Each structure stands twice: as C-alpha cells, then as structure tokens.
C-alpha cells in the first residue's frame, strides 16, 4: 500500500531497462565522446579476414571472449558476406587461361562500444601478439559505409537517382 512503510518493495522495472518491443530498428548513433582527457570514443569494428573459415571463427571467438573478460561492452559479433575469388592461371606456352581453384575469404567483425587510449594500446598489443597465421586484422571506426557493407545494393534506388540527375 502507498501509505505503508513497505511501499515499493515489488518495484522492479527500474532494475531492468530492456523494454524495446521494436521489430529490428538499430540505434547506430554513438558519436565518439572525445573530451580531451576521458577520450571515450565511439563504437569500433574489429575485422578478421581469413581464407580458413575455422581459423577465422576461432579467432573471432577468442577476441570476443577476451572482450567479455576485459569488461568491454561488445555491441555485436557478426559475419560479413563471404567473397569467392576465382584463380585463372596462364597455361604453359601462353595465350591461355585455365581455372586453377576458388578461394572463399570470410570476414568476422566484432563491434565494441567504448574504449580508452591506454586500454586500446594494451588490447591492440594482445591482439597482434595472439594473431594466428594468414589472418588479416583491421581496426576501424564504425561508419555508414561499414554499416552498409553488410546490406545489399538498391538497384531501383540507384536508377531513380540517375533519372533525377
């Protein structure tokens, strides 16, 4: 009861803030908070590119577990679409091109929320020390191009823009 001293003992909605019943809308609005000393910049994308899918997944799991252990707010841990390159090698005596093989490179991206300069230095040192063989590591800021890389093209939108121009 409101007048009883035990009022609000069942108050629980302030202990949890996950009340977003939306279909799939994402925020994607964390600007880099750069205040000079507490340089808590924005979300960062860590890309791991590898031909070996198992190795790429293993290193993505390792870096995600390391982020969880180091109290790093991991925004996402997803996979970009694979790229399948075809090798066309020039046959002996020249003037020919034959199919050699196909290489499917896979990219695993971990989106982290916030970080500081010293901890970023330590984290980069650890990552580059524990990097496996034949894996490309990239550390970037989350931009609109990176966000749209996962999404597919818009041929109709491009045609409409071309007609407008």
């Amino acid at each position: 009861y409101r007048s009883k001293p035990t009022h609000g003992i069942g108050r629980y909605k302030h202990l949890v803030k996950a009340q977003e019943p939306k279909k799939k809308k994402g925020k994607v609005e964390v600007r880099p908070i750069n205040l000079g000393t507490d340089y808590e910049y924005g979300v960062l994308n860590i890309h791991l590119i590898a031909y070996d899918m198992a190795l790429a997944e293993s290193y993505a799991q390792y870096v995600h577990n390391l982020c969880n252990h180091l109290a790093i707010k991991v925004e996402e841990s997803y996979a970009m679409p694979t790229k399948t390159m075809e090798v066309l090698q020039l046959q002996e005596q020249g003037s020919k091109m034959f199919l050699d093989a196909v290489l499917t490179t896979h990219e695993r991206v971990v989106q982290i929320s916030g970080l500081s300069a010293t901890f970023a230095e330590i984290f980069l040192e650890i990552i580059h020390s524990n990097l496996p063989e034949g894996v490309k590591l990239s550390v970037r800021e989350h931009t609109e191009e990176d966000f749209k890389g996962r999404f597919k093209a818009r041929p109709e939108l491009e045609e409409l823009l071309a007609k407008l121009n």
């Binding site: 409101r2 001293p5 035990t6 009022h7 003992i9 108050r11 202990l15 949890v16 803030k17 707010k73």
Partner: peptide
C-alpha cells in the same frame, strides 16, 4: 501519504544508473 521504511530496503544497494556495467546472473538456478 508516504511513510519512511522501517529499515533498509531490499534492492536499494545496487545502483540504478549504468545497468550495462553491472554483472547479471543468467541462470535460473
């Protein structure tokens, strides 16, 4: 009308602000 609690509240120790940095238990056990 409001009355003062006769002792400490159960969930008054944990901080409401910055829930993401507070560890949770994910086990019903």
């Amino acid at each position: 009308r409001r009355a003062a609690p006769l002792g400490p509240m159960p969930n008054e120790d944990i901080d409401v602000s910055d829930l993401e940095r507070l560890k949770k238990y994910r086990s019903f056990d």
